[model samples]
Target: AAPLAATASKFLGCAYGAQQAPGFAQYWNKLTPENGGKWGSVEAVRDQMDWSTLDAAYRFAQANQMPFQMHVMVWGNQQPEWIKTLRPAEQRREIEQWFAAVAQRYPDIALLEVVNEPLNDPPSKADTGGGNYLQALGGNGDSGWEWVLQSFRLARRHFPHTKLMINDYSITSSAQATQKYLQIVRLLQRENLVDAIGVQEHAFETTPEVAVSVHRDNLDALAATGLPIYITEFDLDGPTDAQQLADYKRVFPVFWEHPAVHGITLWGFRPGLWRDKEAAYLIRADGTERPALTWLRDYVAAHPGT
Candidate 1:
């Protein structure tokens, strides 16, 4: 059997940083910058977009012959402060400008999260409170997710060849959220606007059985869309290393074995990660391997893909 990373090469990846961590490149072939690619991080100061961090990540991916997933084109959070100062119409133009700038900069992104956390987890109330976007994108259409549809449509115009995905979290744990997400997926499906489904399984499930079942059910539902599914941001949080490892062992296989799940990207893998509370980091600060990391590497090695 090949190593886990090679075995899951077609669909395994992780969020990355510029610094060389112990096992980053060794276990994952696809790359997603944790924050470097976000709008605020890159374009915080108007047109003078800083690309140093993003550029380095891109360069790393290119050098390693790996696919780089551009995290998001439009998100409610981490938006530039200036965008709110503009009128709704101007904000729409600025939105387009952001997409155009991104597309022009990275012409060949492997994936683009067109819009992140739309409905229930909407942008701040001060920054449109979600109503401005609904109206700006032409109001709720027949599907009631017109803004989502419009987001994808605009993404298509800019990143023509790249795969576009709508990403959200907690969908697996909440049936209502899943239903709402499906509504958007079905709406986008009509126009063939979305190319993939991204389920951010940043879960807090306590039991392995529950985690597996929730994911299995959600995967079944998302797979019905006839789109490839990616475990976009997966991490398990537990107080004990044993619990984390156990939960991962049980929950991961459910998604990995599912034919619809084309890939999985860990949210983070090193200490000082975004979710500091979660014991999901694969490497400790002392550069020692976590139990989850060792298991993942071996698991991937044992289950090689063609």
Candidate 2:
């Protein structure tokens, strides 16, 4: 059964999947599949489509009347092992097929992260989990981001309506890094293929060591591009419950309250997140809300977004 809301809610979301589906709609207004949206996960067997996980994620988003975002279209990691063995030309065909398949399957993906981690983790080789297909997409042409441009062009072609996004990590940690990311963003901007800028804002980048001004300056810089930002993959570690709460209070608002930020998707809140060992999850095994989550609920309710 599907539910419809009178108004479209702004995205205050977290990663979701078959495993992470429990009580998702209770917390998030946006849906981004944690692993199901990965190309490798869907087409692991080559030409065979496995929609089981993706279908579940899509169902939950539609049933709850929440916005849905596909995690990524192209990334250095988490690509099919079979694609690594193909010639560059052959690899290009597979990429096109992937874009077409996803388009055919899910036409309502609100945001499609066309490229992820381009500045830092490009698909150079299989050893580093870089998918080994960068050349397939026209690697480093004139502006040094041709592959990224090509990917976005394909996204623009395949997903005419979905808001295409570029996601990366550590962009807000340094001015230099942010500029490097801007180069690629500018390339996409010129072609008018990108819609939003995403910065992962993970614990390491949001830690006490990194000053909030650093993130603020970078956020200001990205906003100057005139694209609304998305704080994707945001999380703070909890070595102690006290420390996580402290960090959250200090760092979260810099992003949350920024006028440029269109949305914030916490990497995850329940257990078994990538930051599980770091204890970043906001819900305990008993399903009780941590101080950070309690604060977030109050924080967002106090300041709703457009």
Candidate 3:
């Protein structure tokens, strides 16, 4: 049987999967490691980085000939603790080393999230106000998000061939957030620092219709930026199996049919999901597919590649 991933790779050039897990290759044509690619996970102890986890993910994508997305380069959370102790200059050098090392080690990345969740989700207290990382890059000029622009500048210097994107969640649901995100994008676009926009469509709507309308408006607004948009991390939650299926049927199509969307990735489909507690897994432990999975399979089949 033709997998749904085959069709998805056609019209929108689709890719869907969560982290790295057994049987994901059968469904997704692109891969993103859930936690293995993060800085803290790879560099738990200073100066000694572990590539075991991320290397495994890279090998999987290479073997499958799938495009691989490096989850992030900079985020407020999950940074190594030792960096906090370093002086400002030392911290900046360390940050550059991290970027250069990753780019050198993995030269075949397809997409790179230069900075994740910067606006709505700032760095934590653990992140030390993200001042070190931001100051090192130094973009606080007329643009306001000078740090963001600087990060992308470094990303372009290192990963010259890779596409870079800024990712965030809840922007679609909040008009103010969406506008702020657009401001950042506009600044980046002026210098061609941004290659795409990633919007996590984790819905908060009470009904599917409302969800579709709100997302449609937000997507249209994002499309105006003239950059390809990606539905980066998508999943729907409901109180019951029936509700989940209904919500998926209504909301998933809204983005799937939009021309502006280049790809869509599910947060997870099986047990051990990041949001496992929310009952968001589309496949049970026993290998029985949920209604959403069945619907997704059928939907992709009907929209097969040429």
Candidate 4:
């Protein structure tokens, strides 16, 4: 078997949990400094908030020479709950105000995710804290996608240097969930709205046959739209055992070699720091390495390119 260092370019990463994980500084120290911020923490968007952590991570990326992918910008859900009580107009202003501040502050961020995910189904509002928060920019008859375009436009005008992306999760085999989103992206492309697309593959604790099939097919379809696809927020989970470990190792190659897919971000590497307690992450609360981590590092070393 090939050693884990083979696909260094394809070296894996994750989000969130890094803040408190053990040996994080060491992990950042290990990866080659050729790519900037690709394998680092994603600071949840906080306008005017202290950026010590963000800057620290950025410097780490710079020092390590890794590429960075900022996880998000606008989303109704992460807003202060008080935001929900305000009139839509006021809420709209708040969001725009936040975006303006964010863009200006991170003016140099080459890759910025416009919004985490936009939908109004099952009332997307309930599903994602509340829908159309960005819709204050003007949502079309309640399909939260319109503001997505507006944010894309705003990001383009304000943070011209950054590459903007519309990111979302795609688990349903039915394209209906992602179709409207792609249409919005295409329309924006026609009008010149944004740059790339992102798919958050939170696939921990699931069978690879199911996870890989859904993800690969989804990327293939999304790539058909002619937009670059970034495999952001990916992970796999299994019971802490060898069989589970084998299952985790099984899915990396197909993704590492897929041409349409650019690279991946492994949601949260350490287990305890994850938002969802059930999510199958790479380390435990105490930071012991999970069986899957070696598989990932080894896989990345082996498949450096598509």
Best by lDDT: 2
Which candidate comes out best when scored by TM-score? Answer: 2
Error of 4 at 139 (Å): 2.0
User: Cα deviation of 153 in candidate 1 (Å)?
Assistant: 0.8
lDDT tens digits by residue: candidate 2, 102-203: 999898888898888997778877863357999999989898899999999999898888899999998999999999999888888898989999999889
TM per candidate: 0.90, 0.95, 0.91, 0.77
| Minimal lDDT window, size 10, model 3 | 11-20
User: After superposing candidate 1, which stretches have Cα over 4 Å from the reference?
Assistant: 1-3, 19-23, 127-135, 139-142, 205-211
Can you rank all candidates by lDDT, best first?
2, 3, 1, 4
Model 4 residue runs over 4 Å out of place are: 1-11, 16-21, 25-48, 120-135, 142-144, 171-173, 204-214, 285-287
lDDT: the better of candidates 1 and 2: 2
Query: In candidate 3, what are the lDDT values of residues 36-75, reduced to their tens digit?
Result: 7878878878899998888888888899788788987888
Question: Global lDDT of each model?
Answer: 0.75, 0.85, 0.76, 0.56
| Minimal lDDT window, size 10, model 4 | 32-41
Candidate 1 C-alpha lDDT tens digits along 1-306: 332567453558888884334466666788888888877788788788888888888888898788888987766677676666566687788678888988998976888988888765554345532323445565566667777888899999988889998888767665676788898888888889999888887755324445457667877888988998888888776567787788779777787778888888888777666666765676766888778767877777766554
Model 4 / residue 306 / CA error / Å: 5.1
Clashes of each: 4, 0, 1, 28
TM-score of model 3 (CA atoms): 0.91
Name the lDDT of candidate 1.
0.75
